[PDB]
Amino acid sequence: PLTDLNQLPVQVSFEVGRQILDWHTLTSLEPGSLIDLTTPVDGEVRLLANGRLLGHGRLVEIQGRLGVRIERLTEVTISLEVLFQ
Amino acid sequence: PLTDLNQLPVQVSFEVGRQILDWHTLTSLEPGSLIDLTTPVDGEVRLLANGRLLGHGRLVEIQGRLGVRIERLTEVTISLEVLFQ
């Protein structure tokens, strides 16, 4: 139990791409296959929390480490499961 | 009028970086905020098929464009829907 619920861990994804693939395409994927996202290398990023949209950001590079700069945020209702002592 | 199930669409998404921010961190987010994704500039990409983990890959930059090179595929049950005629 957390004395402070603000410490609660939220699952957050950074989505760099989305594509509709048909079963045949999926099925012919293998280690080594290259998927072209077709979008810029300093690309848009959707921030998701539990699969739901939180805002948008832009990939940036910092000393060989990848990061994201937040550009906009949106309001959204996050579900949390909390353990009572 | 889909009569070949091998052509059924699947929504694939590509995700990079950590999957956990606490609430202090999410509530402090604003435009301009920077987030370290806890991965190198290449780094882990997760492939999701309709939101379920389908495999893992690496971000690559092919000719100024973002791509994903597949490294591994995981077994998973995908839910599809067809209109019978």
Characterise this structure.
The structure is a homodimer of 85-residue chains. With 85 residues, chain A is mainly beta. The first copy, chain A, has a single domain (1-85), classed as SpoA-like (Surface presentation of antigens (SPOA), Roll), CATH 2.30.330.10. The first copy, chain A, contains one helix and five strands, in the order βαββββ. The first copy, chain A, has one helix spanning 23-27; strands at residues 9-22, 34-40, 44-49, 52-62, 65-73. In chain A, strands 1-3-4-5 form a four-stranded antiparallel beta sheet. In chain A, a hairpin with a 2-residue loop joins strand 4 and strand 5 (65-73).
Identify the notable features of this structure and list them briefly.
homodimer; 85 residues; mainly beta; Surface presentation of antigens (SPOA); 5 strands; protein transport; type III secretion protein
Shape of chain A: extended
Please identify the oligomeric state. Answer: homodimer
Please estimate the helix content of chain A.
Answer: under 10%
What structural class do helix, strand and pairing data of chain A support?
A: mainly beta
| β-sheet strand percentage of chain A | over 45%
Number of strands of chain A: 5
Distance between the termini of chain A: 5 Å
How many separate domains make up the residues of chain A?
A: 1
Helix and strand run of chain A: EHEEEE
Q: Which protein chains make the most extensive interface, counting residues with beta carbons within 8 Å of the other chain's beta carbons?
A: A-B, 55 and 56 residues
CATH top level of chain A is: Mainly Beta
CATH A-level architecture of chain A: Roll
Main sheet attributes: strand count, strand direction, barrel closure of chain A:
4 strands, antiparallel
Radius of gyration of chain A (CA) equals 17 Å
CATH superfamily of chain A: SpoA-like
Strand order of the largest sheet of chain A: 1-3-4-5
Topology-level CATH name of chain A: Surface presentation of antigens (SPOA)
List the total number of helices of chain A. 1
PDB class: protein transport
Keywords: type III secretion protein, cytosol, protein transport
Assembly: dimeric
Entry title: Crystal structure of YscQ-C from Yersinia pseudotuberculosis
